[PDB]
Each structure stands twice: as structure tokens, then as C-alpha cells.
Design a protein around this nucleic acid. Sequence first.
DNA 1: TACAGATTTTATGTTTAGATCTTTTATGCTTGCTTTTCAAA
Length: 160
Amino acid sequence: SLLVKKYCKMTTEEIIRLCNDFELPREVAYKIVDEYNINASRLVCPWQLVCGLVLNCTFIVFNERRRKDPRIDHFIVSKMCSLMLTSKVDDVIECVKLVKELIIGEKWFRDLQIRYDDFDGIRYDEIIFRKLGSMLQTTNILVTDDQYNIWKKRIEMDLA
DNA sequence: TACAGATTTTATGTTTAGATCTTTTATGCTTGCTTTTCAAA
């Protein structure tokens, strides 16, 4: 288990290797590098911080693919347990929640949230009406128009 | 204007809501010594 190993040694090359197996953009990868570098002397297990950083960035960058396909959300963490050498998935989401405290309110995290238009899993135009307590907020008990359209196209493909 | 009746004026008592100051006690800061877990060899 890579999350158990205390005071371990790592370089930026391993960080780029982890960030290139998730196909993140390069600026986000160097911001992950800088975020590890400004905390590197004070982590009991730096792989905990790195795991939370890449998981929180890969939730944000592919928010549209996660919206149109939830199984990607069941893929990515299921892939990353293969890289942290852990069988249970609870420590990975614990890493996500523990790192989430340390980067919320940071300027680059907020700019990433703005430019991908992703604030805790939804766009601004939905979160403003859930914050206002609107009765007309787009609740999710039906399916969206894009999901309905791609499902209708897929079922018309498999009909003939 | 005459006068009964209503309202005001002046005068005081009853009860509650709150302000200020005094006395005693809690509380936090400082400084010097002692124990204890965790980062590193």
C-alpha cells in the first residue's frame, strides 16, 4: 500500500507519471507539482496528498464525461487502487476528502473550477438556484435531454 | 346664563425594566522547569 508508507521519497518525474496516466492538462500537472512542493516538508505520507490532488483534479477536468457516463467515476478510483496497491476503496475517498480541506479556497483551484465550470459537481447556473432555494431548480428524477437523445440514437442503432 | 356631565390638570401610589458602581472571585498571561510522543538516523 503506497498510502501507508511514511516519509517516503519521490521526485517530480513520478508526479508527471501519475498525472500522465490520467491525461490531465499540463498546467494542472505543474500546479499539482507546486502544491506538493509547498507542503513537502510537512507530510507524514506524501502519497496521500498526491492521491487526493490528482483525484480532485481528475474529477474536475472530466466533469462532462462523468455527467454523461457515471461508470468513469466507477473506473478512475477503481484504476487508482491498482496504483496505490490497495484493495479497499475507502482510503482513496478518505484521501480525497482529506485533501479537499487543504485546497478549497486556493486561488488556482477556484480558477480551475471556473474555467471548467464545475463547482462541487454542477455548473454555476444550477448551483445558484439551489443556493437560492428555487422551486424551479432542475432536480434529477428524470433524465436530461442529451442522455435521452444519445439513448434514442443508440436504441435506433440497435433496432436496425 | 344654568347646570349636569365629560375631560383635563395636578398629584400621588404600584410594579417593572434597566443602569451604575462596589466587592469578591475567576481567568488568562508570563516564565521557568519537567514529561512525552513522533520525525529521523
